[PDB]
């Protein structure tokens, strides 16, 4: 559950992403597949190779998704209903994999944005990603 402050901290942080977000999308996803290779299982029809264009495009999609999410933090189940229906209804993704990717988004943000990566932002972003995570793994429609 997000505090008013979490909501400040998240929007605030995310403005400070410039148009770089999608390059963080690709990298974290890469930290995932490389740090926890059981996660690839979900992408057997994909290019992985260091530098994949497919990974290039998928992270752009993932970041834009969290952009929309930061767009609507008081109503995330509504704002993400479709990704639920894909992740929870069709893909049936194990929520552990979401903790792994969240952690991997946390590790990437901390790579490129140290001066931004305050303990207070670290805690709010984690709660933002568990929330997003909770949403896409839940069957609620």
């Amino acid at each position: 559950v997000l505090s008013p402050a979490d909501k400040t901290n998240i929007k605030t942080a995310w403005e400070k992403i410039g148009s770089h977000g999608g390059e963080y999308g690709a990298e974290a996803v890469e930290r995932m597949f490389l740090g926890f290779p059981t996660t690839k299982t979900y992408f057997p029809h994909f290019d992985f190779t260091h530098g994949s264009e497919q990974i290039k495009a998928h992270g752009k999609k993932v970041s834009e998704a969290l952009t929309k999410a930061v767009g609507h933090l008081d109503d995330l189940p509504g704002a993400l209903s479709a990704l639920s229906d894909l992740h929870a209804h069709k893909l049936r993704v194990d929520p552990v994999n979401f903790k792994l990717l969240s952690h991997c988004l946390l590790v990437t943000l901390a790579n490129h944005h140290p001066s931004e990566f305050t303990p207070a932002v670290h805690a709010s972003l984690d709660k933002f990603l568990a929330n997003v995570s909770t949403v896409l793994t839940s069957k609620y429609r």
Binding site: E30, R31, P119
Partner: protein, 146 residues
């Protein structure tokens, strides 16, 4: 843990450049800040109620190093982490009553910290490695419930 020649070289090399005074401190705070219930186990430490207090706090910085050294000792004794932490595992899990879950959260708070610090150098290939080390320390610190 299992590590390839190269990954083994990275885990150490990197670990060599670690600021021993900062990291475990920064880490424990990040653990306290992010997972607030972990503060129950550290009440005698004073005020933890706020971001700054967590990271202003001297005892937090102090205990933080106590954990850093235990990781380093572990980092030399990867071939025998169960033995290395056997006493320490009993302390947390017969006397301090901590859930083994947090052991896992803390390794991951550490990995972030290391990224936050080393930058491009903490490559996905290097992280790949640490996520294996940290899993182990956790597994290792948890084998007293058996």
């Amino acid at each position: 843990v299992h590590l390839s020649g190269e990954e083994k070289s990275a885990v150490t090399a990197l670990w060599g450049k670690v600021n021993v005074e900062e990291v475990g401190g920064e880490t424990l705070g990040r653990l306290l800040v992010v997972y607030p219930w972990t503060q129950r186990f550290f009440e005698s430490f004073g005020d933890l109620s706020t971001a700054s207090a967590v990271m202003g706090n001297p005892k937090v910085k102090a205990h933080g190093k106590k954990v850093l050294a235990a990781f380093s000792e572990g980092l030399s004794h990867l071939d025998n982490l169960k033995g290395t932490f056997a006493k320490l595992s009993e302390l947390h899990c017969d006397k301090l009553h901590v859930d083994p879950e947090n052991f896992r959260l803390l390794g991951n708070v550490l990995v972030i910290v290391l990224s936050h610090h080393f930058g491009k150098e903490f490559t996905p290939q290097v992280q790949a490695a640490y996520q294996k080390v940290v899993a182990g320390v956790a597994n290792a610190l948890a084998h007293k419930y058996h």
